[PDB]
Amino acid sequence: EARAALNQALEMKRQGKREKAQKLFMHALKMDPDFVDALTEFGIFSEEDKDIIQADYLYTRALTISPYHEKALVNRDRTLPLVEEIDQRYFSIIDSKVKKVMSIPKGNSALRRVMEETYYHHIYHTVAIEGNTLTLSEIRHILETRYAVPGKSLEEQNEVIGMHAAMKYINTTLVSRIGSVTISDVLEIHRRVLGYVDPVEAGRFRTTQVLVGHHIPPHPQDVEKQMQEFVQWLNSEEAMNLHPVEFAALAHYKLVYIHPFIDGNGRTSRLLMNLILMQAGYPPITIRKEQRSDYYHVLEAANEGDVRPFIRFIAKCTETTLDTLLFAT
Amino acid sequence: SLEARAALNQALEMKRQGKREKAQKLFMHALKMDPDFVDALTEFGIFSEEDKDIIQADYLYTRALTISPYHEKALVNRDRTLPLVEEIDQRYFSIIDSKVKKVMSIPKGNSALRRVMEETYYHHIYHTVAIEGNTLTLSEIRHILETRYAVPGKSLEEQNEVIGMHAAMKYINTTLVSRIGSVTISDVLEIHRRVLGYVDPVEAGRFRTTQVLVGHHIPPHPQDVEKQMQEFVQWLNSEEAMNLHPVEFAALAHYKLVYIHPFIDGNGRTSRLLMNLILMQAGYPPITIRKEQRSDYYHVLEAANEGDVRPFIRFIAKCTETTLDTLLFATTEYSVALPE
Ligand SMILES: Nc1ncnc2c1ncn2[C@@H]1O[C@H](COP(=O)(O)OP(=O)(O)OP(=O)(O)O)[C@@H](O)[C@H]1O
Ligand SMILES: Nc1ncnc2c1ncn2[C@@H]1O[C@H](COP(=O)(O)OP(=O)(O)OP(=O)(O)O)[C@@H](O)[C@H]1O
């Protein structure tokens, strides 16, 4: 019961429980996730395994519940600047790999092959996370030939066509264009993303209220005003001062939070993310299909107070993209 | 100008000696060299009445007078045939009206009618997409709409045309048919938005921005298209249009939209749908311009552009009859062949 599982895990730490300590710490927070002592003690336990980022999260969560909790505050005050350095140090590692892909001359036969294949790779994964059953070979066939695939839903194949049209529009019209991003530009991306599936709802705002896991987004009445504030933030001086990868990740989150469409919210958000990156001089990033579980958890964590685990998750995806380019080239 | 005044005379002397088929071919060749040859129209009009073809004869005389108003030989013939054709045409609408009453006489929930009304829905889709060069079969179009799975080795654009139509008819049958009040420019765009939405979601429900050729027809410039549609919907809701016979009003509404050609694509499909909305609002079943009538469908549209729209109005009335003939036949066929 309450305050029971922690002590079991805490005495196990003295013994050297190893996995047995962790399992009980996880079970203790399963019964009560707002148990301030279980967070602080599991935070201390995390630093023993050199996991300072996880520890800082647990302390920050504990203080959001109990601001004046001494044991958590004295630990956070130490880790707060330490993590800020670790995070900034990770962005500088990414910035060096981004410079190493720009160092490669345009016209390289190796890069052309990768940039081509990774375009289809991005489409496969962005549709696969939302439960599209089409393979990479099938998605290649759809876009190359424009003939339908045997024994597969027309809705699934129109999702693929919708994405290709949306990226073509971005890469052509938006990426290079001078000036601010408008509410019109966001609708125009969605109009292509969902146009071939639902031509009625494509490029028009959500009219009904919906549940997204455990997230209840703004009411259709408010959605319009939420988007006017969102585009104002995108063009704000504050947002320009942020590191591209962070600004991209925050732009992503704020759109999936507002959830202004009946469908294509995740897809439009992942596209808008890449527009921010490509406008700042970063290649298009792919949140892979197998990262669906993680992708949601960091979005859950973002809703409850701390957005950083999401910002880090995007930066990790950014690195794996850059790693794939430099390797394949 | 006597390039084919020898071809007329050639055909005319052939008529005297008999030369039934030989006369026609030369009359057709005479109008091929000069289609605005007033004597070739009037003489071929006289020739037509000999085969009891008064409708064709009246067309030729009316065409001749549009070129040469005061041409005596044509005028004396037209003055006779003008009221005669008006009677023949009105008599055809009364034949249709009796067959429309005979489909309403059939009970509301008849099991035989339900089967036909279902099959003819897919039949209408097959033909409306087939005329514009869609290669999908009837069985394939049934599979698309029933299962919502794609067809092997056929373009996604062709299959999205089928989905676009089904959505457009569903919207019409549900929202528009039963709705009280006037038809608006918004309603026309909303039909097109579904018709073309699954193929071209960008241009769906938005007016033509560029100028295009349609066979030998140059439609109003994109600048004027908006005003042409405001006058079109004003005519649709006008008292004059309500006084016209449903089949004529349907056919004229069809023509005026394909004339204006206010979209990049889906002009014919939107027109054929709007036609059926007029008919169904007046209490007529949805009519199908079949795929094999593509050649005829264009000729009567050409004929309409040059002055006389009646051949089109008659072409729609003929399609209306063949629809009603198919329903009454199949319904009586199934009544015996099905249980109940
Ligand atoms: N708890 C959450 N809070 C906020 N956003 C979330 C949450 N879980 C998932 N999301 C985001 O919203 C999407 C889920 O929305 P939903 O399930 O309605 O749409 P989908 O069909 O999965 O994808 P799409 O929005 O691309 O059509 C995810 O793809 C993700 O980007
Ligand atoms: N000479 C003509 N004058 C007026 N309208 C014509 C003429 N020829 C064809 N049309 C109309 O235009 C339609 C064909 O237009 P067009 O060839 O641009 O489109 P499509 O792709 O064949 O068909 P849709 O309009 O259904 O997409 C015909 O169905 C008819 O309604």
XYZ file of C-alpha atoms and ligand atoms in Angstrom:
731
model
C 0.000 0.000 0.000
C 0.983 3.723 0.448
C 4.704 4.223 1.428
C 5.263 0.391 1.592
C 6.964 -0.575 -1.740
C 9.582 2.274 -1.450
C 11.010 0.966 1.911
C 11.109 -2.606 0.411
C 13.139 -1.161 -2.561
C 15.226 1.162 -0.259
C 16.443 -1.658 2.108
C 17.108 -3.762 -1.078
C 19.476 -0.932 -2.313
C 21.658 -1.383 0.871
C 21.842 -5.193 0.166
C 22.726 -4.633 -3.557
C 19.317 -5.686 -5.040
C 20.499 -4.466 -8.532
C 17.386 -5.238 -10.733
C 15.296 -6.138 -7.590
C 15.755 -2.500 -6.313
C 14.624 -0.969 -9.685
C 11.580 -3.339 -10.103
C 10.248 -2.340 -6.596
C 10.984 1.413 -7.273
C 8.959 1.116 -10.568
C 6.089 -0.798 -8.790
C 6.089 1.848 -5.952
C 5.450 4.676 -8.524
C 2.879 2.427 -10.361
C 0.653 2.425 -7.181
C 1.197 6.219 -6.592
C 3.061 8.175 -9.343
C 2.668 11.426 -7.256
C 4.626 9.823 -4.316
C 7.304 12.555 -3.722
C 9.652 10.330 -1.570
C 9.605 7.475 -4.199
C 10.711 10.004 -6.924
C 13.543 11.595 -4.800
C 14.886 8.162 -3.608
C 14.692 6.680 -7.193
C 16.419 9.913 -8.410
C 19.317 9.315 -5.917
C 19.368 5.612 -7.079
C 19.601 6.747 -10.782
C 22.809 8.865 -10.223
C 24.555 5.671 -8.865
C 24.216 4.236 -12.462
C 25.449 7.646 -13.879
C 21.866 8.416 -15.172
C 21.832 12.175 -14.227
C 19.142 13.076 -16.888
C 16.573 10.555 -15.439
C 17.487 11.650 -11.837
C 16.905 15.372 -12.721
C 13.451 14.467 -14.243
C 12.368 12.629 -11.006
C 13.527 15.575 -8.753
C 11.785 18.160 -11.068
C 8.559 16.010 -10.996
C 8.775 15.686 -7.144
C 9.112 19.531 -6.753
C 6.104 20.175 -9.132
C 4.020 18.171 -6.529
C 5.850 19.320 -3.299
C 7.776 22.585 -4.038
C 9.403 22.939 -0.534
C 10.497 19.227 -0.174
C 14.112 19.741 1.118
C 15.757 16.405 0.011
C 14.529 16.926 -3.630
C 15.345 20.721 -3.752
C 19.037 20.337 -2.588
C 19.500 17.587 -5.287
C 17.714 19.577 -8.106
C 19.738 22.819 -7.422
C 22.893 20.703 -8.201
C 21.529 18.743 -11.258
C 19.587 21.692 -12.885
C 22.704 23.409 -14.404
C 24.538 20.021 -14.877
C 21.733 18.688 -17.209
C 21.460 22.090 -19.057
C 25.214 21.617 -19.904
C 24.752 17.876 -20.868
C 21.770 18.847 -23.157
C 23.614 21.848 -24.778
C 26.698 19.534 -25.199
C 24.449 17.043 -27.149
C 23.194 19.835 -29.529
C 26.884 20.805 -30.238
C 27.559 17.077 -31.127
C 24.553 17.248 -33.582
C 25.719 20.679 -34.982
C 29.172 19.094 -35.808
C 27.471 16.147 -37.675
C 25.155 18.659 -39.528
C 28.365 20.555 -40.611
C 29.911 17.188 -41.768
C 26.895 16.535 -44.141
C 27.123 20.149 -45.550
C 30.924 19.543 -46.080
C 29.904 16.772 -48.610
C 29.628 18.410 -52.094
C 26.200 18.503 -53.904
C 26.110 16.092 -56.913
C 27.849 13.158 -55.077
C 26.460 9.840 -56.533
C 26.472 8.170 -53.035
C 24.454 11.062 -51.411
C 21.895 11.119 -54.335
C 21.164 7.359 -53.723
C 20.700 7.875 -49.900
C 18.658 11.163 -50.166
C 16.345 9.298 -52.660
C 15.885 6.097 -50.528
C 15.465 8.067 -47.206
C 12.564 10.085 -48.816
C 10.551 6.798 -49.188
C 11.894 5.671 -45.729
C 10.401 8.869 -44.119
C 6.952 8.177 -45.770
C 6.936 4.453 -44.688
C 7.534 5.383 -40.977
C 5.289 8.544 -40.683
C 2.242 6.476 -41.947
C 3.333 3.181 -40.197
C 3.137 4.699 -36.619
C -0.631 5.507 -37.150
C -1.274 1.852 -38.243
C -0.666 1.800 -42.060
C 0.061 -1.819 -43.218
C 1.860 -0.873 -46.531
C 5.524 -2.085 -46.915
C 8.443 0.104 -48.223
C 8.449 -1.752 -51.636
C 4.630 -1.145 -51.953
C 5.064 2.616 -51.083
C 7.856 2.826 -53.763
C 5.497 1.158 -56.350
C 2.598 3.601 -55.484
C 4.747 6.786 -55.947
C 6.872 5.520 -58.940
C 4.096 3.877 -61.098
C 0.888 5.527 -59.647
C -0.824 2.059 -59.951
C -2.678 0.586 -56.895
C -1.290 -2.368 -54.799
C -3.205 -5.719 -54.734
C -5.253 -6.598 -51.580
C -4.598 -3.319 -49.638
C -7.143 -0.578 -48.611
C -7.451 2.477 -50.972
C -7.478 4.731 -47.814
C -3.955 3.445 -46.825
C -2.609 4.053 -50.405
C -4.220 7.586 -50.500
C -2.354 8.344 -47.179
C 0.959 7.655 -49.084
C -0.073 9.911 -52.078
C -1.237 12.611 -49.569
C 2.222 12.664 -47.848
C 4.246 12.775 -51.157
C 2.095 15.790 -52.302
C 2.531 17.490 -48.846
C 6.396 17.137 -48.896
C 6.576 18.233 -52.614
C 4.581 21.401 -51.598
C 6.856 22.026 -48.512
C 10.208 21.353 -50.347
C 9.046 23.550 -53.329
C 6.812 26.380 -51.943
C 7.529 26.744 -48.151
C 11.210 25.719 -47.413
C 12.795 28.407 -49.713
C 10.015 31.083 -49.275
C 10.979 34.361 -47.440
C 8.910 35.731 -44.484
C 6.781 34.385 -41.562
C 4.841 31.037 -41.370
C 1.011 31.646 -41.472
C -2.104 29.650 -40.318
C -2.826 29.330 -44.118
C 0.510 27.420 -44.655
C -0.435 24.838 -41.911
C -3.948 24.276 -43.452
C -2.307 23.992 -46.950
C 0.033 21.165 -45.667
C -2.998 19.328 -44.090
C -5.073 19.940 -47.313
C -2.533 17.666 -49.172
C -1.798 15.200 -46.254
C -5.528 14.245 -45.828
C -6.934 15.514 -49.208
C -6.849 12.090 -50.996
C -8.444 10.293 -47.942
C -11.026 12.885 -46.657
C -11.386 15.762 -49.196
C -14.248 17.321 -47.075
C -12.244 17.737 -43.780
C -8.870 18.455 -45.559
C -7.694 22.049 -44.781
C -10.573 22.773 -42.303
C -10.349 22.827 -38.439
C -11.749 20.132 -36.056
C -15.516 20.756 -35.377
C -16.014 18.063 -32.614
C -14.221 17.308 -29.258
C -12.075 14.076 -29.097
C -9.859 12.111 -26.602
C -6.131 11.492 -27.476
C -4.957 8.703 -25.089
C -5.468 10.655 -21.790
C -5.180 14.164 -23.433
C -8.361 16.321 -23.916
C -7.332 19.088 -26.395
C -8.824 22.633 -26.661
C -12.583 22.798 -27.607
C -13.310 23.442 -31.346
C -14.506 27.000 -30.345
C -10.985 27.817 -28.938
C -8.862 25.868 -31.565
C -8.836 28.892 -33.993
C -7.392 31.277 -31.293
C -4.878 28.559 -30.127
C -3.475 28.373 -33.738
C -3.265 32.241 -34.003
C -1.099 32.166 -30.782
C 0.881 29.114 -32.145
C 1.907 30.890 -35.445
C 2.649 34.100 -33.403
C 5.086 31.964 -31.273
C 6.624 30.307 -34.432
C 7.491 33.837 -35.795
C 8.296 35.248 -32.261
C 11.901 36.435 -31.485
C 11.962 34.039 -28.429
C 11.467 30.994 -30.772
C 14.273 32.184 -33.172
C 16.715 32.396 -30.164
C 16.030 28.654 -29.374
C 18.292 25.923 -30.922
C 16.711 24.597 -34.184
C 16.264 20.972 -32.834
C 14.518 22.328 -29.643
C 12.374 24.884 -31.626
C 11.438 22.041 -34.082
C 10.504 19.654 -31.181
C 8.476 22.395 -29.330
C 6.620 23.365 -32.596
C 5.838 19.597 -33.072
C 4.512 19.211 -29.452
C 2.379 22.436 -29.397
C 0.516 21.347 -32.627
C -0.234 17.743 -31.390
C -1.342 19.375 -28.051
C -3.808 21.771 -29.846
C -4.840 18.823 -32.150
C -6.655 21.208 -34.562
C -7.723 18.502 -37.148
C -10.011 15.379 -36.966
C -7.106 13.354 -38.539
C -3.497 13.934 -39.772
C -2.410 15.853 -36.591
C 0.734 13.689 -36.002
C 1.641 13.625 -39.758
C 1.172 17.461 -40.163
C 3.238 17.981 -36.924
C 6.118 15.689 -38.140
C 6.059 17.608 -41.517
C 5.988 21.101 -39.829
C 8.907 19.859 -37.610
C 11.028 19.071 -40.757
C 10.094 22.492 -42.337
C 11.565 24.271 -39.208
C 14.743 22.060 -39.408
C 15.182 22.447 -43.240
C 14.611 26.279 -42.970
C 17.393 26.312 -40.262
C 19.636 24.023 -42.439
C 19.020 20.484 -41.004
C 18.018 17.349 -43.014
C 14.470 15.869 -42.733
C 14.252 13.662 -39.544
C 12.314 10.313 -39.350
C 10.557 9.188 -36.095
C 10.744 5.400 -36.840
C 7.714 3.006 -36.522
C 9.347 0.965 -33.656
C 9.682 4.220 -31.561
C 5.809 4.547 -31.375
C 5.783 3.404 -27.669
C 8.612 5.857 -26.643
C 7.156 8.700 -28.850
C 3.859 8.595 -26.802
C 5.538 8.272 -23.315
C 7.663 11.473 -23.889
C 4.425 13.197 -25.161
C 2.608 11.988 -21.964
C 5.605 13.262 -19.860
C 5.344 16.629 -21.765
C 1.599 17.027 -20.838
C 2.316 16.513 -17.068
C 4.981 19.315 -16.851
C 8.458 18.417 -18.274
C 8.799 18.696 -22.138
C 12.627 18.050 -22.126
C 12.359 14.213 -22.564
C 10.518 14.957 -25.902
C 13.135 17.623 -26.951
C 15.862 14.961 -26.229
C 13.830 12.229 -28.104
C 13.760 14.484 -31.265
C 17.534 15.263 -30.868
C 18.200 11.453 -30.642
C 16.119 10.915 -33.874
C 18.083 13.856 -35.472
C 21.430 12.084 -34.637
C 20.272 8.639 -36.010
C 19.258 10.453 -39.290
C 22.698 12.218 -39.522
C 24.456 8.903 -38.545
C 22.603 7.092 -41.436
C 23.527 9.821 -44.041
C 27.299 10.067 -43.172
C 27.573 6.200 -42.925
C 25.717 5.439 -46.232
C 27.858 8.253 -47.848
C -18.964 30.139 -104.505
C -19.609 26.796 -106.362
C -16.994 24.321 -104.932
C -19.813 21.843 -103.951
C -22.791 23.395 -105.905
C -21.872 20.493 -108.301
C -22.021 18.016 -105.312
C -25.576 19.302 -104.426
C -26.744 18.977 -108.101
C -24.993 15.514 -108.236
C -27.115 14.473 -105.160
C -30.264 16.302 -106.496
C -30.266 14.509 -109.940
C -29.600 11.211 -108.006
C -32.870 11.855 -106.013
C -34.900 12.156 -109.306
C -33.583 8.748 -110.609
C -33.972 7.071 -107.137
C -30.359 6.522 -105.864
C -31.662 6.374 -102.207
C -28.280 5.793 -100.369
C -26.280 7.510 -103.222
C -28.313 10.753 -102.611
C -27.497 10.839 -98.814
C -23.678 10.330 -99.235
C -23.488 13.246 -101.782
C -25.767 15.488 -99.571
C -23.377 14.788 -96.602
C -20.246 15.468 -98.798
C -21.888 18.736 -100.096
C -22.240 20.053 -96.463
C -18.682 18.733 -95.644
C -17.190 21.194 -98.246
C -19.468 24.094 -97.042
C -21.630 23.467 -93.911
C -23.085 27.055 -94.228
C -24.423 26.233 -97.781
C -28.108 27.354 -97.434
C -29.373 25.459 -100.581
C -27.703 22.138 -99.461
C -29.540 22.388 -96.058
C -33.003 23.244 -97.581
C -32.737 20.511 -100.316
C -31.492 17.875 -97.746
C -34.369 19.044 -95.450
C -36.924 18.360 -98.277
C -35.142 14.966 -98.869
C -35.463 14.099 -95.101
C -39.324 14.516 -95.050
C -39.553 11.846 -97.860
C -38.181 9.305 -95.260
C -40.681 10.734 -92.641
C -37.740 12.399 -90.730
C -39.540 15.735 -89.918
C -37.292 16.477 -86.834
C -34.029 16.354 -88.930
C -35.738 18.376 -91.760
C -36.837 21.121 -89.262
C -33.207 21.326 -87.900
C -31.764 21.842 -91.461
C -34.385 24.579 -92.306
C -33.785 26.343 -88.900
C -29.961 26.183 -89.523
C -30.425 27.563 -93.112
C -32.540 30.537 -91.789
C -29.940 31.351 -89.020
C -27.445 31.920 -91.951
C -29.927 33.407 -94.546
C -33.050 34.715 -92.687
C -35.017 35.790 -95.853
C -34.315 32.572 -97.925
C -37.882 31.904 -99.269
C -37.687 28.095 -99.984
C -36.450 27.423 -96.368
C -38.892 29.912 -94.672
C -42.104 28.472 -96.321
C -40.961 24.933 -95.208
C -39.999 26.015 -91.605
C -43.348 27.893 -91.025
C -45.073 24.475 -91.647
C -42.634 22.228 -89.633
C -42.092 24.673 -86.658
C -45.456 23.906 -84.909
C -45.460 20.239 -86.185
C -42.113 19.476 -84.366
C -43.234 21.414 -81.194
C -46.234 18.953 -81.083
C -43.992 15.854 -81.802
C -41.558 16.970 -78.992
C -44.377 17.746 -76.445
C -45.995 14.360 -77.423
C -42.655 12.606 -76.517
C -42.539 14.301 -73.031
C -46.158 13.063 -72.379
C -44.974 9.474 -73.302
C -42.103 9.885 -70.718
C -44.513 11.402 -68.077
C -46.762 8.250 -68.404
C -43.710 5.906 -67.897
C -42.546 8.056 -64.872
C -46.096 7.590 -63.393
C -45.820 3.776 -64.061
C -42.558 3.582 -61.931
C -44.255 5.582 -59.068
C -47.273 3.151 -59.343
C -44.813 0.333 -58.277
C -45.023 -0.099 -54.439
C -42.551 1.811 -52.176
C -40.686 -1.208 -50.619
C -40.961 -3.746 -53.527
C -38.073 -6.327 -53.259
C -37.691 -6.398 -57.117
C -37.370 -2.538 -57.367
C -34.820 -2.421 -54.437
C -32.544 -4.895 -56.373
C -32.782 -2.819 -59.653
C -32.400 0.641 -57.939
C -29.231 -0.811 -56.231
C -27.676 -2.315 -59.459
C -28.534 0.815 -61.595
C -26.660 3.025 -59.003
C -23.376 1.165 -59.892
C -24.469 1.193 -63.611
C -24.743 5.063 -63.479
C -21.184 5.342 -61.945
C -19.636 2.935 -64.561
C -21.005 5.038 -67.508
C -20.444 8.627 -66.116
C -16.672 7.807 -65.586
C -16.383 5.543 -68.730
C -17.295 8.404 -71.207
C -14.242 10.469 -69.968
C -11.928 7.428 -70.570
C -12.000 5.412 -67.274
C -10.909 1.760 -67.950
C -12.551 0.225 -64.783
C -15.256 -2.489 -65.387
C -18.684 -2.622 -63.573
C -17.532 -5.587 -61.350
C -14.328 -3.616 -60.401
C -16.422 -0.454 -59.547
C -18.725 -2.668 -57.362
C -15.608 -4.143 -55.578
C -14.156 -0.592 -54.932
C -17.401 0.751 -53.303
C -18.419 -2.513 -51.461
C -14.977 -3.573 -50.008
C -12.997 -0.231 -50.192
C -9.924 -2.315 -51.298
C -7.977 -1.274 -54.465
C -8.145 -3.220 -57.815
C -4.938 -4.932 -59.113
C -3.057 -3.279 -62.055
C -5.340 -0.181 -62.408
C -4.432 3.547 -61.836
C -5.235 4.996 -58.336
C -6.562 8.169 -60.135
C -9.245 6.041 -61.960
C -10.301 4.322 -58.654
C -10.419 7.742 -56.815
C -12.794 8.985 -59.624
C -15.219 6.133 -58.599
C -14.958 7.005 -54.821
C -15.401 10.739 -55.712
C -18.701 10.022 -57.586
C -20.177 7.740 -54.817
C -19.462 10.528 -52.219
C -20.996 13.196 -54.579
C -24.271 11.187 -55.114
C -24.506 10.309 -51.343
C -24.244 14.110 -50.616
C -26.895 14.954 -53.326
C -29.368 12.126 -52.352
C -28.973 13.039 -48.601
C -28.403 16.853 -48.345
C -29.641 18.482 -51.638
C -32.533 16.354 -53.140
C -34.873 16.704 -50.071
C -33.662 20.229 -48.978
C -36.210 23.141 -49.268
C -35.268 26.442 -51.035
C -33.080 27.629 -53.981
C -29.884 25.995 -55.430
C -26.747 28.149 -54.665
C -23.218 28.475 -56.244
C -22.013 26.864 -52.921
C -24.076 23.662 -53.660
C -22.404 23.293 -57.147
C -18.855 23.727 -55.649
C -19.792 21.227 -52.842
C -20.768 18.558 -55.496
C -17.439 19.176 -57.390
C -15.495 19.146 -54.032
C -16.531 15.425 -53.663
C -16.427 14.475 -57.436
C -12.734 15.578 -57.845
C -11.663 15.683 -54.124
C -10.018 12.187 -54.078
C -8.137 12.862 -57.411
C -7.143 16.600 -57.101
C -7.829 17.853 -53.519
C -6.215 21.286 -54.367
C -8.532 22.204 -57.336
C -11.659 20.454 -55.842
C -14.393 23.062 -55.055
C -12.395 25.972 -56.637
C -13.082 27.666 -60.048
C -10.914 27.275 -63.220
C -7.943 29.772 -63.146
C -6.610 29.125 -66.743
C -8.247 29.250 -70.253
C -8.698 25.843 -72.053
C -10.087 24.413 -75.373
C -13.017 21.870 -75.304
C -13.058 20.250 -78.802
C -13.853 23.461 -80.803
C -15.518 25.305 -77.813
C -13.617 28.196 -76.076
C -15.486 28.782 -72.757
C -15.725 32.083 -70.778
C -12.359 33.469 -69.446
C -11.571 32.629 -65.760
C -12.207 36.370 -64.931
C -15.857 36.058 -66.200
C -16.577 32.431 -64.966
C -17.679 33.680 -61.463
C -20.316 36.104 -62.964
C -21.477 33.392 -65.488
C -22.232 31.015 -62.518
C -24.112 33.805 -60.579
C -26.373 34.222 -63.704
C -26.618 30.364 -64.081
C -27.931 29.808 -60.466
C -30.261 32.877 -60.919
C -31.727 31.083 -64.029
C -31.981 27.697 -62.139
C -34.152 29.431 -59.430
C -35.927 31.733 -62.015
C -39.746 31.301 -62.511
C -39.126 30.858 -66.319
C -37.004 27.692 -65.622
C -39.691 26.217 -63.247
C -42.349 26.636 -66.044
C -40.174 24.440 -68.400
C -40.774 20.615 -68.522
C -38.409 18.844 -66.041
C -36.539 16.842 -68.808
C -35.963 20.101 -70.838
C -34.982 22.162 -67.701
C -32.600 19.287 -66.680
C -31.035 19.154 -70.219
C -30.674 23.013 -70.416
C -29.089 23.141 -66.877
C -26.658 20.356 -68.046
C -25.716 22.258 -71.288
C -25.266 25.738 -69.664
C -22.765 24.289 -67.068
C -20.633 22.363 -69.681
C -20.743 25.603 -71.808
C -19.417 27.767 -68.874
C -16.925 24.911 -68.026
C -16.099 26.499 -64.621
C -13.660 23.721 -63.413
C -10.252 22.384 -64.682
C -11.772 18.823 -64.542
C -15.104 17.129 -63.576
C -17.274 19.554 -65.669
C -19.188 16.740 -67.489
C -19.535 14.623 -64.273
C -20.777 17.639 -62.160
C -23.212 18.554 -65.035
C -24.615 14.950 -65.280
C -25.029 14.970 -61.420
C -26.718 18.462 -61.364
C -29.004 17.175 -64.212
C -30.183 14.219 -61.999
C -30.705 16.592 -58.970
C -33.154 18.697 -61.133
C -34.965 15.468 -62.285
C -35.099 13.879 -58.753
C -36.339 17.230 -57.234
C -39.122 17.214 -59.945
C -39.851 13.471 -59.262
C -37.877 11.615 -62.025
C -35.373 8.736 -61.476
C -31.598 9.331 -61.993
C -30.796 9.006 -65.769
C -27.597 7.464 -67.290
C -25.918 8.826 -70.492
C -24.326 5.464 -71.538
C -20.605 5.106 -72.525
C -21.419 4.040 -76.162
C -23.374 7.363 -76.646
C -20.084 9.403 -76.233
C -19.966 10.185 -80.030
C -23.681 11.300 -80.168
C -23.404 13.176 -76.781
C -20.657 15.473 -78.275
C -22.395 16.025 -81.704
C -25.652 17.301 -80.017
C -23.409 19.530 -77.767
C -21.629 20.827 -80.948
C -25.097 21.392 -82.586
C -26.157 23.283 -79.370
C -23.121 25.684 -79.607
C -23.952 26.633 -83.267
C -27.587 27.721 -82.508
C -30.121 24.848 -82.017
C -30.108 23.194 -78.499
C -33.215 20.983 -79.229
C -31.200 17.937 -80.512
C -29.524 17.860 -77.009
C -32.924 18.292 -75.185
C -34.228 15.322 -77.312
C -30.991 13.286 -76.633
C -31.586 13.661 -72.815
C -35.324 12.741 -73.254
C -34.214 9.598 -75.236
C -31.772 8.687 -72.360
C -34.656 9.355 -69.849
C -36.909 6.842 -71.756
C -34.165 4.100 -71.961
C -33.676 4.502 -68.128
C -37.480 4.182 -67.481
C -37.662 1.262 -70.025
C -34.821 -0.571 -68.114
C -36.500 -0.059 -64.646
C -40.055 -1.222 -65.666
C -38.586 -4.204 -67.673
C -36.122 -5.407 -64.941
C -38.688 -4.797 -62.097
C -41.336 -7.002 -63.881
C -38.474 -9.481 -64.744
C -37.401 -9.766 -61.022
C -41.028 -9.807 -59.606
C -41.413 -13.378 -61.090
C -37.686 -14.381 -60.752
C -37.376 -13.377 -57.007
C -39.421 -14.540 -53.982
C -42.193 -12.068 -52.839
N -1.056 11.881 -25.090
C -0.855 12.627 -26.173
N -0.921 13.977 -26.058
C -0.717 14.723 -27.151
N -0.445 14.337 -28.396
C -0.387 12.997 -28.477
C -0.573 12.097 -27.448
N -0.435 10.796 -27.917
C -0.173 10.928 -29.196
N -0.132 12.247 -29.596
C 0.135 12.786 -30.936
O -1.071 12.792 -31.662
C -1.136 11.639 -32.539
C -2.312 10.788 -32.133
O -3.528 11.355 -32.683
P -4.636 10.376 -33.302
O -4.515 9.024 -32.682
O -5.965 11.055 -33.256
O -4.146 10.302 -34.830
P -3.394 9.193 -35.711
O -4.354 8.646 -36.715
O -2.662 8.261 -34.803
O -2.324 10.101 -36.481
P -2.512 11.449 -37.339
O -2.772 12.542 -36.333
O -1.226 11.652 -38.099
O -3.692 11.191 -38.243
C 0.235 10.951 -32.456
O 0.707 10.608 -33.754
C 1.129 11.994 -31.779
O 1.773 12.842 -32.706
N -18.202 21.106 -78.090
C -18.578 21.148 -76.815
N -19.289 22.217 -76.376
C -19.664 22.254 -75.090
N -19.446 21.366 -74.124
C -18.739 20.322 -74.588
C -18.281 20.140 -75.877
N -17.590 18.940 -75.975
C -17.640 18.428 -74.767
N -18.328 19.221 -73.881
C -18.581 18.965 -72.459
O -17.337 18.866 -71.801
C -17.164 17.545 -71.225
C -15.740 17.094 -71.432
O -14.836 18.105 -70.926
P -13.296 17.702 -70.753
O -12.874 16.857 -71.910
O -12.499 18.926 -70.442
O -13.379 16.785 -69.437
P -13.271 15.208 -69.172
O -12.073 14.952 -68.318
O -13.429 14.478 -70.466
O -14.586 14.962 -68.294
P -15.069 15.598 -66.898
O -15.556 16.989 -67.217
O -16.167 14.700 -66.390
O -13.851 15.592 -66.010
C -18.232 16.673 -71.890
O -18.649 15.631 -71.017
C -19.352 17.677 -72.169
O -20.207 17.817 -71.058
